[PDB]
Amino acid sequence: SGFRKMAFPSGKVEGCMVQVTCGTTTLNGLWLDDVVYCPRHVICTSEDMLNPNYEDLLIRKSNHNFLVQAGNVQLRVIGHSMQNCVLKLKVDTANPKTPKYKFVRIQPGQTFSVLACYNGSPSGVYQCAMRPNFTIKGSFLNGSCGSVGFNIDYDCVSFCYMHHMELPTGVHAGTDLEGNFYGPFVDRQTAQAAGTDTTITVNVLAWLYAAVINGDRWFLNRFTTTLNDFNLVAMKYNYEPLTQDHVDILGPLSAQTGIAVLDMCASLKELLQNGMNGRTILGSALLEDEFTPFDVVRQCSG
Amino acid sequence: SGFRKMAFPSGKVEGCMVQVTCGTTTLNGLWLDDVVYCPRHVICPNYEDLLIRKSNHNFLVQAGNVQLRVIGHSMQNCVLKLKVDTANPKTPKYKFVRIQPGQTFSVLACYNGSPSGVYQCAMRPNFTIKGSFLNGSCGSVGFNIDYDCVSFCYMHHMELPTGVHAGTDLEGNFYGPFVDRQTAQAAGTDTTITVNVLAWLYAAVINGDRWFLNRFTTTLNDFNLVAMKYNYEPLTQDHVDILGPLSAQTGIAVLDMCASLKELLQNGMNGRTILGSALLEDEFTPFDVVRQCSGVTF
Numbered sequence: 001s002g003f004r005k006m007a008f009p010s011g012k013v014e015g016c017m018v019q020v021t022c023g024t025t026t027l028n029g030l031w032l033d034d035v036v037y038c039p040r041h042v043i044c045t046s047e048d049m050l051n052p053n054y055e056d057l058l059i060r061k062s063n064h065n066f067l068v069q070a071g072n073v074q075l076r077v078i079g080h081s082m083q084n085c086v087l088k089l090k091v092d093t094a095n096p097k098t099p100k101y102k103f104v105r106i107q108p109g110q111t112f113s114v115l116a117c118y119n120g121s122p123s124g125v126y127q128c129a130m131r132p133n134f135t136i137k138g139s140f141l142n143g144s145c146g147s148v149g150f151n152i153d154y155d156c157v158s159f160c161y162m163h164h165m166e167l168p169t170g171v172h173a174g175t176d177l178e179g180n181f182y183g184p185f186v187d188r189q190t191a192q193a194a195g196t197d198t199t200i201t202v203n204v205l206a207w208l209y210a211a212v213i214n215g216d217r218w219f220l221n222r223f224t225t226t227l228n229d230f231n232l233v234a235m236k237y238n239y240e241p242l243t244q245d246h247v248d249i250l251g252p253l254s255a256q257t258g259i260a261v262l263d264m265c266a267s268l269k270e271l272l273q274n275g276m277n278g279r280t281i282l283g284s285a286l287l288e289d290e291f292t293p294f295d296v297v298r299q300c301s302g
Numbered sequence: 303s304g305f306r307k308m309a310f311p312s313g314k315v316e317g318c319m320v321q322v323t324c325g326t327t328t329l330n331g332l333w334l335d336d337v338v339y340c341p342r343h344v345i346c347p348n349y350e351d352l353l354i355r356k357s358n359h360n361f362l363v364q365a366g367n368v369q370l371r372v373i374g375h376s377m378q379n380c381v382l383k384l385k386v387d388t389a390n391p392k393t394p395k396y397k398f399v400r401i402q403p404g405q406t407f408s409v410l411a412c413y414n415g416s417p418s419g420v421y422q423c424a425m426r427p428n429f430t431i432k433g434s435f436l437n438g439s440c441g442s443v444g445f446n447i448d449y450d451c452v453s454f455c456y457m458h459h460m461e462l463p464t465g466v467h468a469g470t471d472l473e474g475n476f477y478g479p480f481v482d483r484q485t486a487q488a489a490g491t492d493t494t495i496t497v498n499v500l501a502w503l504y505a506a507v508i509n510g511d512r513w514f515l516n517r518f519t520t521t522l523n524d525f526n527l528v529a530m531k532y533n534y535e536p537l538t539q540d541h542v543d544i545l546g547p548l549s550a551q552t553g554i555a556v557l558d559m560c561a562s563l564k565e566l567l568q569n570g571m572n573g574r575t576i577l578g579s580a581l582l583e584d585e586f587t588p589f590d591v592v593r594q595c596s597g598v599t600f
């Protein structure tokens with residue numbers, strides 16, 4: 001029993017964190033084999049931030065301008081290339097602690113663990129989700145740039161996020177490990193804003209199935225709904241549209257508990273209408289949307 | 303910006319998890335130097351009578367794919383200490399510490415000697431933990447990281463009928479009035495960790511949430527009369543002293559923040575949230591708030 005927001009063990013990722021220094025700027029890098037991946041804005045200075053020409057800034061750099069630190073040992077940079085908004089620093093030593101890894105691009109609603117780092121040193125780990133507005137509600141201070149998000153399904157580390165910036169609302173923007181940003185964001189200090197955020201419907205439904213598996217059935221009702229009538233109601237509460245793919249993905253949880261997806265949808269409809277009325281679901285007074293159907297299956301069963 | 307339930311990096315602890323098998327039972331062990339620590343119920347009760355019948359070769363210890371050979375065994379309260387032939391090369395700088403209720407820690411939940419997840423939790427005033435554990439999770443450990451030193455504070459033993467968890471410190475002494483036996487046991491009535499809620503209200507202020515603040519103050523005695531009415535733990539002068547740095551950083555006296563908490567308890571949140579929560583959060587200590595709102599590394 002018990003349902004906690006659970007992060008992956010960070011050990012495999014800690015053994016890859018390095019500190020990257022270019023001039024006055026210091027941030028984190030990911031050392032995998034003989035390459036250190038870090039945000040390309042490490043080469044940017046004071047005025048070179050509203051409209052930086054990264055190709056023009058990088059051509060002025062030599063390998064010895066980049067100081068890379070792995071614990072107390074300094075790594076020697078022997079090459080550099082840019083791939084979108086990531087800088088790839090070729091180093092003269094391959095990381096012996098390199099785990100079995102993959103670079104994956106995630107879709108909104110997917111979850112991942114974050115190893116928050118400062119000066120190449122890991123300070124904490126937490127679980128979070130790619131919001132539908134492509135931002136993450138993380139916990140990051142100055143110097144956390146270059147921190148990474150990951151999942152460790154089986155013995156392999158899937159890197160899915162690298163942190164680049166904080167938006168004026170306090171939420172965070174970053175890229176996949178190939179340097180492509182999530183969302184309409186740019187690694188420029190221009191006026192940017194996160195779009196209106198919505199609730200991840202498929203995730204809330206998965207968390208309601210987790211509550212049923214853990215013995216909580218107070219919110220269930222004798223009603224069902226059509227998928228169309230559910231979406232019309234859900235849109236009014238700023239909930240993401242629920243698709244037929246989401247219904248198919250909730251299939252295993254539906255068969256395990258004996259509650260049809262559209263039956264669970266009717267219960268969510270009623271929760272949105274009534275609120276909780278002094279009650280909680282899995283120790284929460286709000287509807288939790290940062291657990292996917294896969295996360296529920298993983299923690300509630302294996 | 304941002305305030306998350308943050309666990310310590312588990313790397314140093316992952317390198318210590320092993321699988322312990324005795325007869326039909328399989329659980330986790332903590333391999334530090336040449337000793338593997340695990341719950342004594344792996345041999346299951348008269349534990350002295352059960353242990354005298356076991357030989358070293360009855361305990362199968364697995365470290366990844368490598369098998370460790372047991373060369374001795376002894377009991378220390380409710381922990382079994384299996385002497386092994388090989389010292390763990392991944393042994394970190396460590397200490398065994400006993401924590402007090404209200405103190406927080408990271409839990410590296412494991413199954414079959416393999417770490418599967420890490421989460422943050424607190425020792426409840428009723429000495430239970432609201433964890434997330436399944437069958438096979440026994441022997442999973444709780445820890446804090448202090449500079450480069452890992453302080454092990456918890457070893458999981460059992461789940462109570464309410465779904466909450468009971469375990470011991472690494473010296474085998476249980477937290478709470480629990481016993482390691484299949485019998486009728488219940489967690490006592492739980493209370494809210496007042497000093498922790500106040501620390502989390504200071505974290506909300508640092509993150510720009512000030513709606514709950516007011517012009518009022520209270521006496522420590524008048525606050526404790528109200529707090530006792532709402533199943534909150536008594537707030538002591540030590541708690542007030544510990545909240546000092548957060549009070550000076552935000553400019554809100556502890557008894558001023560206590561007057562805000564009094565109004566939240568009597569009047570509720572009124573459709574509003576604090577740090578994305580509609581309930582008052584009590585599993586962040588004043589030190590957890592300071593460490594996260596300053597970014598200290600390990």
Ligand SMILES: COCCN1Cc2ccc(Cl)cc2[C@H](C(=O)Nc2cncc3ccccc23)C1
Pocket residue numbers: 041140141142143144145164165166167186187188189303
């Ligand atoms: C206060 O001045 C911040 C200026 N930042 C402007 C900016 C613009 C584009 C890009 Cl890609 C990076 C940045 C930098 C940035 O977002 N850094 C930070 C990251 N993550 C949390 C941060 C919390 C606080 C501070 C800074 C954070 C620096």
Ligand SMILES: [Cl-]
Pocket residue numbers: 105106107110
């Ligand atoms: Cl995905």
